[PDB]
Design a protein around this nucleic acid. Sequence first.
RNA 1: GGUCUGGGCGCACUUCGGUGACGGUACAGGCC
Length: 16
Amino acid sequence: SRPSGAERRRRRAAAA
RNA sequence: GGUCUGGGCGCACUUCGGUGACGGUACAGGCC
């Protein structure tokens, strides 16, 4: 969309 | 940052939708 900033916090939170 | 968001930016991917724990949680907001 770009990724929704919250969606950046979800990137690392998919993993950690 | 407990954590979620929002929508771009300055960059790289790609079906051009979204994917990217990159500058960077930085910006401004929710129960902090």
